[PDB]
Design a protein around this motif. Structure first.
Motif, PDB file in Angstrom:
ATOM      1  N   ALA A 256      26.000  33.692  81.668  1.00  0.00           N
ATOM      2  CA  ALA A 256      27.182  34.477  81.329  1.00  0.00           C
ATOM      3  C   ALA A 256      28.249  33.608  80.679  1.00  0.00           C
ATOM      4  N   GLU A 257      28.441  32.389  81.191  1.00  0.00           N
ATOM      5  CA  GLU A 257      29.396  31.469  80.580  1.00  0.00           C
ATOM      6  C   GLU A 257      28.977  31.104  79.161  1.00  0.00           C
ATOM      7  N   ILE A 258      27.679  30.882  78.945  1.00  0.00           N
ATOM      8  CA  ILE A 258      27.186  30.557  77.609  1.00  0.00           C
ATOM      9  C   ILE A 258      27.395  31.731  76.661  1.00  0.00           C
ATOM     10  N   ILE A 259      27.148  32.952  77.141  1.00  0.00           N
ATOM     11  CA  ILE A 259      27.353  34.138  76.313  1.00  0.00           C
ATOM     12  C   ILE A 259      28.829  34.303  75.973  1.00  0.00           C
ATOM     13  N   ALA A 260      29.709  34.057  76.947  1.00  0.00           N
ATOM     14  CA  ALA A 260      31.144  34.132  76.688  1.00  0.00           C
ATOM     15  C   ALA A 260      31.576  33.080  75.673  1.00  0.00           C
ATOM     16  N   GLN A 261      31.031  31.866  75.783  1.00  0.00           N
ATOM     17  CA  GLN A 261      31.340  30.824  74.809  1.00  0.00           C
ATOM     18  C   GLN A 261      30.857  31.211  73.418  1.00  0.00           C
ATOM     19  N   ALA A 262      29.664  31.805  73.330  1.00  0.00           N
ATOM     20  CA  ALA A 262      29.155  32.259  72.041  1.00  0.00           C
ATOM     21  C   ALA A 262      30.039  33.353  71.453  1.00  0.00           C
ATOM     22  N   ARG A 263      30.501  34.283  72.291  1.00  0.00           N
ATOM     23  CA  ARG A 263      31.394  35.335  71.813  1.00  0.00           C
ATOM     24  C   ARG A 263      32.723  34.759  71.339  1.00  0.00           C
ATOM     25  N   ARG A 264      33.256  33.775  72.068  1.00  0.00           N
ATOM     26  CA  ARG A 264      34.497  33.130  71.648  1.00  0.00           C
ATOM     27  C   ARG A 264      34.312  32.398  70.325  1.00  0.00           C
ATOM     28  N   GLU A 265      33.174  31.722  70.156  1.00  0.00           N
ATOM     29  CA  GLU A 265      32.883  31.062  68.887  1.00  0.00           C
ATOM     30  C   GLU A 265      32.760  32.078  67.759  1.00  0.00           C
ATOM     31  N   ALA A 266      32.149  33.230  68.039  1.00  0.00           N
ATOM     32  CA  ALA A 266      32.047  34.285  67.035  1.00  0.00           C
ATOM     33  C   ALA A 266      33.423  34.798  66.633  1.00  0.00           C
ATOM     34  N   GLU A 267      34.304  35.009  67.613  1.00  0.00           N
ATOM     35  CA  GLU A 267      35.656  35.465  67.308  1.00  0.00           C
ATOM     36  C   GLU A 267      36.421  34.421  66.501  1.00  0.00           C
ATOM     37  N   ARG A 268      36.274  33.145  66.863  1.00  0.00           N
ATOM     38  CA  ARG A 268      36.927  32.080  66.110  1.00  0.00           C
ATOM     39  C   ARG A 268      36.404  32.014  64.680  1.00  0.00           C
ATOM     40  N   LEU A 269      35.091  32.174  64.503  1.00  0.00           N
ATOM     41  CA  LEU A 269      34.515  32.165  63.163  1.00  0.00           C
ATOM     42  C   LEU A 269      35.015  33.345  62.341  1.00  0.00           C
ATOM     43  N   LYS A 270      35.120  34.523  62.960  1.00  0.00           N
ATOM     44  CA  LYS A 270      35.653  35.683  62.252  1.00  0.00           C
ATOM     45  C   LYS A 270      37.106  35.462  61.847  1.00  0.00           C
ATOM     46  N   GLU A 271      37.911  34.890  62.746  1.00  0.00           N
ATOM     47  CA  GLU A 271      39.302  34.599  62.413  1.00  0.00           C
ATOM     48  C   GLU A 271      39.399  33.581  61.283  1.00  0.00           C
ATOM     49  N   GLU A 272      38.549  32.552  61.316  1.00  0.00           N
ATOM     50  CA  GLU A 272      38.547  31.556  60.249  1.00  0.00           C
ATOM     51  C   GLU A 272      38.128  32.172  58.922  1.00  0.00           C
ATOM     52  N   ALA A 273      37.143  33.072  58.947  1.00  0.00           N
ATOM     53  CA  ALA A 273      36.731  33.753  57.724  1.00  0.00           C
ATOM     54  C   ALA A 273      37.852  34.625  57.176  1.00  0.00           C
TER      55      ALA A 273
END
Lengths: 51, 55
Positions: B37-54
């Motif tokens: 669950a922590e890994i999935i949350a980290q992946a989701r946070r990375e996805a959100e950060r990537l979307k914000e950067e895009a």
């Protein structure tokens, strides 16, 4: 005391007492064998349980 | 007598060891689920950060 009849009677009494003692000693041999067998069985059972 | 009862005592000890193993497996599974669950949350946070950067 020197009498053949007395000697014969003493020998007969000794033989009867010898038979009685033979039965008495035959009992102790069985008792000792039972004790030894019980000890051996206990040791074997303990070893098997530990293993 | 100890060996005679200890056959069943060892059977019960094996059963208790199996129960303890099941408890340890449950604890390990809970810890692994928390880590996943922590890994999935980290992946989701990375996805959100990537979307914000895009953006």
């Amino acid at each position: 005391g020197i009498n053949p009849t007395l000697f014969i009677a003493q020998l007969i009494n000794f033989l009867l007492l010898i038979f009685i003692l033979r039965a008495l000693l035959y009992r102790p041999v069985m008792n000792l064998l039972n004790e030894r067998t019980r000890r051996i069985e206990e040791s074997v059972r303990d070893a098997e349980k530990v293993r | 007598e100890q060996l005679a009862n200890a056959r069943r005592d060892y059977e019960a000890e094996i059963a208790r060891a199996r129960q303890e193993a099941a408890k340890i497996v449950a604890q390990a599974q809970e810890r692994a689920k928390q880590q996943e669950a922590e890994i999935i949350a980290q992946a989701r946070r990375e996805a959100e950060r990537l979307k914000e950067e895009a953006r």
